[PDB]
């Protein structure tokens, strides 16, 4: 009888009530993990939880705005109470970037983008580390973007923050290695979600982006789910400090 | 919970020992029909014996990847026996000898570039038409961490592994219209015969561990899961990608 | 010729080490340079030393973290020289060795602010002036830590990697204005900033072995590439990071 | 005169990028021996640079021939007393062709001339640079090393390979005080690249595709090479510098 690869593991996935995070949450649970979903809006949490509990998956949810230290610490407490520990963290939140010239980006946009996109995952990782230590180790996946390698103009704050996350991933992987905590990164290309709607709103704009990105199709949320589940599993025990691009062939880096 | 490579047919070059053998075993555990192959018939024999004795759908044939005739025959062998080809894993390398660039002969450069760079390109060429007939396929090329972080003393080998990064990219772009995916595995230090020089003395092992900033050396099976995943339709949105399996050893952003 | 003849350059954090070496070189290559840092006394001494070498260098206080200091830096240069051609952004927070587990939220905020946000806003403040000159050159100082972080400095590491992203995104954004944006990424240079890594002689030797280098860098080892990148001889180089690290591993 | 009294070999330096490099090095004070496959190209190259008052001489060297490489080194030593700089610039002309149509002969010639030859040419100069207390090597790769276009797979692979050669040589040769760096040009207007710019319609198409405002010229590559060859770049080794006018490459 083939065993579940995340049998008896406990996972937190932030920003997991829609799109990529939701797709990741579902797969981890499909792969045997107890999962706690969260996002900012309680009405988003309930529907995600209802949908996934509808499928017989070990899933519960709570509100957690990753920008709020209270929420982050409460997310960890909820999971530990319910399941007795934490083995996996997937950090997936990002601030919706407004398209504009760097000359029109305000200081408040910079502050919010760096806070939510860069500081928050660092502090969210800090919050889970002691619990992961108790279990003998763990796995962290940070979600950046192809934009880290290939920036488009108009999204400078967002671009910078996703590149920063390549460093956060590398530096945490080295620091947390003695605790047997692996730290990897998912860098999606253009995935069809509400987040990216501006870029596939029109069938003309979808075709224009495909030609620009040198891709045959846009990604779906579930195209990101398998690699994250693999990375979170003991089968990937010799992979740490690694960013995996899931971009359908769009240019990234060697 | 399905076999992720059910009904798929896979060639793995250089699959009678170490990483290649472990990839072969895992592809077959995940449902694939696998043809294993290497230069020496004796290794092919016991490779097949071992894996068939575990109940895996595996057969073998001799294939030196430097020989056009062997490459073509490997493909013919799989087509005849299974009806087509879905997956190629190119794993062969020339065993490099430690030496200065001042003592590397022209014949060493030629052989290294032939076997390590040209042969995977021609092997892939040999499978493309068969993958086209199945509606697409997956290719995985085995490079090395050396491609990003070369050690002195192995310059021809180092150059060939970096070249393979380029081969993976250029082929992924070329073959995308045929729905063929091309990705690359870049292992760090894995305990095999190939690498024995770097881990035969326990003092050398702990020395390498500190040099490479790792807590342990890899085993062959540490490479199998990612390759089996990349060869699957669960990775349909991953092509042109090199994945490093080096236990944290530095590579690149 | 004098490759930067009649060009006007701002270098932030330019009263010691790398930033001072850059200021000296730009000036030697013909440029009018305005040097600046937080402390007036540091500014005074840097200016005195360079003017005594007959170079066209004046100073002013500018803490790059303060909006008003950045605006005043530009205003000072525009009043004295008539415009701005070159910005080199060189300031960073001094990093303290410690675990991610001990790094406070306040350390994250300050590091991201001074090391990442400030360069972006300092660039914003020089863009309109560079436009009026027909274009210009921006060089951002990051670090080898951007590519090859060591443990104990995570916030600084993350901020330096962010700067690679900033360089690239700004290069693309400002290309239509004929503004080039490139980045210097130094390896271990012997300055006060890095003194924890070289003041003890046995530590220095240890870092050489670890970093795979034959010697540590000196501030002047960084100055030539920066002055080149600011010249019209580099007019087809933008979006580029150049590592000055004595062969220490970085990237392909 | 940053290169005063230095002796520079530049392969494939009778036209385009190699020629612009040879000119600049000579302008910066170096004695330069230019070379390529054809004597009339060499003679024209040499005549033009000598007419500018530069210390340049020439000789024939096909980089694919062991005897030519060694004789190039002997020629420079005989004339000037030693060798300080090597710039390796030669490449086989690539023609658009699907990987399915690339012959094994094209794979061999491309790996030979683009990868093995630079390595063996460096090997040829190393003992001489040792006698001078060190030296500087620059290898010309391409933006194609990072961002390959379809239809040029062998060339693309060979240019990525040169990134590795730069890195492995820089490490191996550092103890002999020999620095090794790489130039990676974007689209430069030369005969080598004519398929991508000769037609104006094609030029505009490539500019859009590469996200550049202009094509490069050969002299756009000269300064960085001369810099890298100078002692002002003594803390730079193992480094590839892209000269691509903003086209994407890498972080
Ligand atoms: N093309 C792409 O779609 C693409 C490409 C590359 C990278 N990414 C990355 O993928 C992530 C976005 O996911 P997506 O594309 O799947 O978007 P999506 O489908 O729109 O989902 C966004 C999710 O984030 C949650 N969220 C937003 N702000 C939050 C916060 N401050 N704290 C906690 N949760 C928050 C939302 O729920 P609430 O509204 O309830 O908070 C929702 O669950 C980002 O990290 C993004 O950079 C996306
Ligand atoms: N081990 C490591 O630390 C490490 C690290 C990075 C990369 N790699 C890469 O991993 C790959 C395999 O290494 P390994 O460590 O698993 O070696 P291994 O355990 O010694 O196995 C080598 C296999 O290659 C076969 N082989 C050798 N030359 C061949 C050829 N020309 N054609 C067909 N088969 C050939 C051998 O069988 P026959 O002798 O019967 O031909 C054997 O089955 C290589 O590409 C290597 O560069 C290894
Ligand atoms: N090994 C290395 O030294 C190394 C390696 C890689 C990168 N770097 C980068 O090089 C830069 C550091 O230069 P360095 O090593 O030359 O340091 P340094 O010799 O100590 O000089 C630091 C300079 O920065 C000024 N400064 C500090 N904070 C400032 C602020 N907020 N606003 C304006 N000026 C400020 C100082 O003057 P005041 O005290 O008067 O403000 C001083 O002139 C940083 O960007 C660093 O990340 C250095
Ligand atoms: N867009 C571009 O033009 C571009 C972009 C990236 C990289 N590059 C690189 O730039 C380098 C030079 O190309 P280019 O564009 O300057 O070409 P170019 O203007 O056509 O000049 C090529 C030079 O190479 C010589 N040559 C050709 N084969 C040779 C050989 N086997 N041995 C010695 N010399 C040889 C030619 O002289 P003879 O005919 O007399 O031998 C000529 O002097 C190549 O390495 C190429 O890969 C060019």
Q: Whole-angstrom distance between the N-terminal and C-terminal Cα of chain D? A: 33
Residue C164: list chain A partners with CB under 8 A.
Answer: 163
Nearest to C249 by CA among C139, C150, C116: C150
- From the CA of B40, how far away is ligand 2's center (Å)? 12
Question: What is the number of residues in chain A?
Answer: 254
Taking a C-beta distance cutoff of 8 angstroms, is the pair B191, B209 a contact? no
The candidate with the shortest Cα–Cα distance to A87, out of A141, A39, A40, A168, is A141
Q: Does C165 touch chain A (CB under 8 A)?
A: yes
Q: Do C252 and B149 touch (CB under 8 A)?
A: no
- Smallest Cβ distance to A248: which of B229, B237, B250? B237
Length of chain C as a residue count: 252
Method by which this entry was solved: X-ray
| Residue of A16, A8, A46, A42 whose CA lies nearest to A233 | A8
* Full 3-state SS string of chain A: CCCCCCCCCEEEECCCCCHHHHHHHHHHHHCCCEEEEEECCHHHHHHHHHHHHHCCCCEEEEECCCCCHHHHHHHHHHHHHHHCCCCEEEECCCCCCCCCCCCCCCHHHHHHHHHHHHHHHHHHHHHHHHHHHHCCCEEEEEECCHHHCCCCCCCHHHHHHHHHHHHHHHHHHHHHHHHCEEEEEEEECCECCCCCHHHCCCHHHHHHHHHHHCCCCCECHHHHHHHHHHHCCHHHCCCCCCEEEECCCCCCCC
CA dihedral B226, B231, B237, B243 (to 10 degrees): 30
Asked whether D138 lines ligand 4 (CB < 6 A), one says: no
Q: What angle do CA D112, D113, D115 make, to 5 degrees?
A: 70
User: Residue D111: which of B101, B113, B154 has the nearest Cβ?
Assistant: B113
Contacts of B125 (CB under 8 A, 6+ apart): D99, D100
- What are the E-state strand segments in C189-245? 241-244
Chain C residue with Cα closest to A153: C173
Expressed as residue numbers, the domain containing B75 is 1-253
Measured distance CA(C27)–CA(C31) in Å, rounded: 5
The dihedrals phi and psi of D106, each to the nearest 5 degrees, come to -65, -40
Residue A29 CA to residue A21 CA, distance in Å, equals 12
CB A227, CB B229: distance < 8 Å = yes
- In this complex, the chains that touch D, judged by 3 or more CB pairs closer than 8 A, are A, B, C
D194 vs D13, D110, D113, D142, D191, CA distance in Å? Answer: 18, 19, 20, 15, 5
> Ligand 4: does its nearest atom lie under 6 Å from the Cβ of D184?
no
Distance separating alpha carbons of residues A68 and A120, to the nearest angstrom: 8
Interface residue C170 vs chain A (CB under 8 A) = yes
Distance CA C30, CA D141 (A): 33
Tell whether ligand 3 has an atom less than 6 A from the beta carbon of residue C189.
Answer: yes
Pocket probe mutation, ligand 3, options C94, C161, C191, max atoms within 8 Å of Cβ? C191
C-beta of residue B60 within 8 angstroms of C-beta of residue B47: yes
Say how many Å lie between the CA of residue D157 and the centre of ligand 4.
17
Q: Is C18 annotated as a binding residue?
A: yes
Is the minimum CB–CB distance between D198 and chain C shorter than 8 Å?
Answer: no
Q: In what helix (H) or strand (E) does residue C109 lie, and over which residues does it extend?
A: helix C105-112
Sorted by sequence, the CB contacts under 8 Å of residue B61 that are 6+ apart come out as B35, B37, B44, B73, B74, B77
Q: How many CA atoms lie within 13 A of B99 on its CB side?
A: 12
Sign for the CA dihedral angle at D72, D73, D76, D77 comes to negative
Q: In what order do the strands lie in the sheet with A34-39?
A: A59-63, A34-39, A10-13, A88-91, A138-143, A181-188, A243-246
Question: Ligand 1 centroid to A39 CA: how many Å?
Answer: 9
Coil vs helix vs strand at C123: helix
Q: How many CB pairs under 8 A join A and D?
A: 14
Backbone angles phi, psi at D123, to 5 degrees: -50, -45
CB C170 within 8 A of CB A102: yes
Taking the C-alpha atoms of residue C21 and residue B148, their distance in angstroms, rounded to an integer, is: 32
Residue of chain C nearest B253, judged by CA positions: C147
Residue C217 Cα distances to A123, C141, C191, angstroms: 34, 15, 9
Residue among D151, D242, D160, D159 at smallest CA distance from D195: D151
Q: How far is A212 from chain D, CA to nearest CA, in Å?
A: 8
N-term to C-term CA, chain B:
35
DSSP 8-state class, residue C93: P
Whether C222 and C78 have beta carbons less than 8 Å apart is answered as: no
Q: How far apart are CA B38 and CA B58, in angstroms?
A: 14
Mark yes or no for CB contact D248/A251 under 8 Å: yes
Selected residue of D101, D148, D158, D162 to mutate for chain B interface (largest B Cβ count, 10 A): D148
Q: Which residues of C touch A129 (CB under 8 A)?
A: 101
Residues A16 and A48 sit within 8 Å (Cβ to Cβ): yes
Give strand pairing partners of D87.
D10, D138
**Chain D (176-195) residues lying within 8 Å, Cβ to Cβ, of chain C:** 179, 186
What phi, psi does B34 have (nearest 5°)?
-120, 130
Identify the bridge partners of residue C239 per DSSP, sorted by sequence position.
none
Residue B20 annotated as binding site: yes
Nearest one of C183, B22, B26, B203 to B8, comparing CA atoms: B26
**Residues forming a β-bridge with B60:** B36
Label each residue of chain B as H, E or C.
Answer: CCCCCCCCEEEECCCCCHHHHHHHHHHHHCCCEEEEEECCHHHHHHHHHHHHCCCCCEEEEECCCCCHHHHHHHHHHHHHHHCCCCEEEECCCCCCCCCCHHHCCHHHHHHHHHHHHHHHHHHHHHHHHHHHCCCCEEEEEECCHHHCCCCCCCHHHHHHHHHHHHHHHHHHHHHHHHCEEEEEEEECCECCCCCHHHCCCHHHHHHHHHHHCCCCCECHHHHHHHHHHHCCHHHCCCCCCEEEECCCCCCCC
Question: Which among B165, B219, B225 has CB closest to A254?
Answer: B165
A238 is catalytic: no
Give the span between the Cα atoms of C146 and C155, in whole angstroms.
11
Tell me the nearest-neighbour CA distance from B138 into chain D, angstroms: 16
Q: How close D233 gets to chain A, by Cα (Å)?
A: 26
SS3 for C1?
coil
Nearest CA to ligand 4 atom 47: D91
Contact D123, D158 (CB under 8 A): no
**Structural contact between residues C105 and A73, judged by C-beta atoms closer than 8 angstroms:** no
The DSSP result for C3-70, as a single string, is TTTT-EEEESS-SSHHHHHHHHHHHHTT-EEEEEES-HHHHHHHHHHHHTTT--EEEEE--TT-HHHH
Tokens of B79: 């087509």
Give the C-alpha separation, B206 to B215, whole Å: 9
User: By the 8 A CB rule, do D50 and D56 touch?
Assistant: yes
SS3 C245: coil
CATH of the domain at C25: 3.40.50.720
Q: Nearest-CA neighbor of B44 among B27, B62, B26?
A: B62
- Does D146 reach chain A within 8 Å, measured CB to CB? yes
- Characterize A119-139 residue by residue with b for buried, 16 or more Cβ atoms within 10 angstroms of its Cβ, and e for exposed: bbbbbbbbbbbebbeebebbb
CA D221/CA D241 separation, integer angstroms:
10
Give the residue numbers of the binding site of A for NADP(+): 12-36, 162
Is residue A108 exposed (0-12), middle (13-18) or buried (19+ Cβ within 10 Å)? Answer: exposed
Residue D183 CA to residue D141 CA, distance in Å, equals 6
Within 8 A by CB and 6+ apart from A85, the residues are A10, A131, A134, A135
CA A40 / ligand 1 centre spacing (Å): 11
Write the CB contacts of D129 (distance below 8 Å, at least 6 apart in sequence).
D83, D84, D86, D135, D176, D178
Handedness of CA A65, A67, A68, A71 (dihedral sign): positive
User: How many beta carbons lie within 10 A of that of residue A179, not counting itself?
Assistant: 15
User: How many domains does chain D divide into?
Assistant: 1
The CA B195 to ligand 2 mean position distance, Å, reads: 9
Which ligand neighbours the alpha carbon of B95 most closely?
A: 2
- Element holding C94 (H helix, E strand): none
Tokens 């021809």 belong to residue: B156
Q: How far is the CA of D75 from the centre of ligand 4 (A)?
A: 22
Q: Residue B93 CA: which ligand is closest?
A: 2
**Within 13 Å and on the Cβ side, how many CA atoms surround A214?**
20
Decide if B125 touches D, using CB distance below 8 A: yes
Q: d(Cα B18, Cα B219) in Å, to the nearest integer?
A: 8
CB D167 within 8 A of CB B251: no
Sign of the CA dihedral with A94 first, then A96, A99, and A104 last:
negative
CB neighbours of residue B130 within 10 Å: 20
- Among all ligands shown, which has an atom nearest to the Cα of A23? 1
Please say whether the dihedral angle defined by the alpha carbons of residues D114, D117, D119 and D124, taken in this order, is positive or negative.
Answer: negative
| Residue the block writes with tokens 């690679």 | C164
Contact A253 D250 (CB under 8 A): yes
DSSP state of C217: B
Please give the distance, rounded to the nearest whole angstrom, from the Cα atom of residue C154 to the centre of ligand 3: 18
CA dist B149 to A184, C34, D27, D141, Å? 20, 41, 36, 18
Q: Does residue C24 have a known ligand-binding role?
A: yes
Q: With beta carbons less than 8 A apart as the criterion, state whether C189 and C219 touch.
A: yes
Cβ atoms B60, B13 nearer than 8 A: no
Token pair 């026996």: residue: B81
**Residue C143, C-beta contacts closer than 8 angstroms, at least 6 positions apart:** C92, C156, C160, C185, C186
Q: Please indicate whether, in this complex, the C-beta atoms of B155 and D172 are within 8 angstroms of each other.
A: yes
Protein residue closest via CA to atom 32 of ligand 3:
C63
Q: Which neighbouring-strand residues pair with C89?
A: C140
Spatial distance between the Cα atoms of C173 and C160, rounded to a whole number of angstroms: 20
Record the resolution, in angstroms.
Answer: 1.7
Residue C20 neighbours by CB under 8 Å, 6+ apart = C14, C35, C46, C219
Compute the Cα dihedral for B223, B229, B235, B239 and give only its sign: positive
Contact by Cβ (8 Å): A121, A12? no
Tell me, using a 6 A CB cutoff, whether residue A247 lines ligand 1: no
Distance from CA of B142 to the nearest CA of D (A): 15
Q: Which residues of C are catalytic?
A: 156
Q: Decide: C143 and C191 in contact? Cβ < 8 Å.
A: no
| Number of neighbouring beta carbons within 10 Å of residue B176 | 20
| CA-A117 nearest atom, ligand 1 | 45
Q: Cα–Cα distance between C24 and C53 in angstroms, integer?
A: 9
Structure tokens at B130: 């068969």
Inspect the interface and report whether the beta carbons of A167 and C160 lie closer than 8 Å: yes
A35 strand-pairing partners: A11, A59
Of all residues in chain A, the one with the smallest CA distance to D248 is A150
DSSP letter (8 states) at residue C117: I
B162 contacts in C (CB within 8 Å)? Answer: 252
Q: Which of C174, C188, C170, C197 is nearest to C250 (CA)?
A: C188
Q: What are phi and psi of A41, to 5 degrees?
A: -100, 125
CB contact set of B27 (below 8 Å; sequence gap of 6+): B5, B10, B12, B34, B87, B89, B227, B228, B231
Judge whether D250 is closer than 8 Å to chain A, CB to CB. Answer: yes
- CB-nearest to B248 from A189, A233, A241 is A241
* Rounded CA separation C197/D191 (Å): 51
Please report the DSSP string for chain D in residue order. Answer: -TTTT-EEEESS-SSHHHHHHHHHHHHTT-EEEEEES-HHHHHHHHHHHHHTT--EEEEE--TT-HHHHHHHHHHHHHHHS---EEEE---PPP----TTT--HHHHHHHHIIIIIHHHHHHHHHHHHHHHTT-EEEEEE--GGGTSPPTT-HHHHHHHHHHHHHHHHHHHHHGGGTEEEEEEEE-SB-SGGGGGGTSSHHHHHHHHHHHT-SS-B-GGGTHHHHHHHHSGGGTT--S-EEEESTT-----
For B211, which residue in chain C has the nearest alpha carbon? C210
Q: Does residue D92 sit at the C interface (CB-CB below 8 Å)?
A: no
Q: Are D107 and D206 spatial neighbours (Cβ–Cβ below 8 Å)?
A: no
B168 CA: distance to closest CA in chain A (Å): 9
Distance CA B199, CA B217 (A): 9
Chain A residue numbers touching B253 (CB-CB < 8 A): 148-149, 166-167, 170, 243, 253
């Amino acid at each position: 009888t083939r065993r579940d690869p995340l049998a008896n593991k406990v996972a937190l996935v932030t920003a997991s009530t829609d799109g990529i995070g939701f797709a990741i949450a579902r797969r981890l649970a499909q792969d045997g993990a107890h999962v706690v979903v969260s996002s900012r809006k309680q009405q988003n949490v309930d529907q995600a939880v209802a949908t996934l509990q509808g499928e017989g998956l070990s899933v519960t949810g709570t509100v957690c705005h990753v920008g709020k230290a209270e929420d982050r610490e409460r997310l960890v407490a909820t999971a530990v109470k319910l399941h007795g520990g934490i083995d996996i963290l997937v950090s997936n939140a990002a601030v919706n970037p407004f398209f504009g010239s760097i000359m029109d980006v305000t200081e408040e946009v910079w502050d919010k983008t760096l806070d939510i996109n860069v500081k928050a995952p660092a502090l969210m990782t800090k919050a889970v580390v002691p619990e992961m230590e108790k279990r003998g180790g763990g796995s962290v996946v940070i979600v950046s973007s192809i934009a880290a390698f290939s920036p488009s103009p108009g999204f400078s704050p967002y671009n910078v923050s996703k590149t920063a996350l390549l460093g956060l991933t590398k530096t945490l992987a080295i620091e947390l290695a003695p605790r047997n905590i692996r730290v990897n990164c998912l860098a999606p290309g253009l995935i069809k979600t509400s987040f990216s709607r501006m870029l596939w709103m029109d069938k003309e704009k979808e075709e224009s982006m495909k030609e620009t990105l040198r891709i045959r199709r846009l990604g779906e949320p579930e195209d990101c789910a398998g690699i994250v589940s693999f990375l979170c599993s003991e089968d990937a025990s010799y992979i740490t400090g690694e960013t995996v691009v899931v971009g359908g062939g769009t240019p990234s880096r060697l």
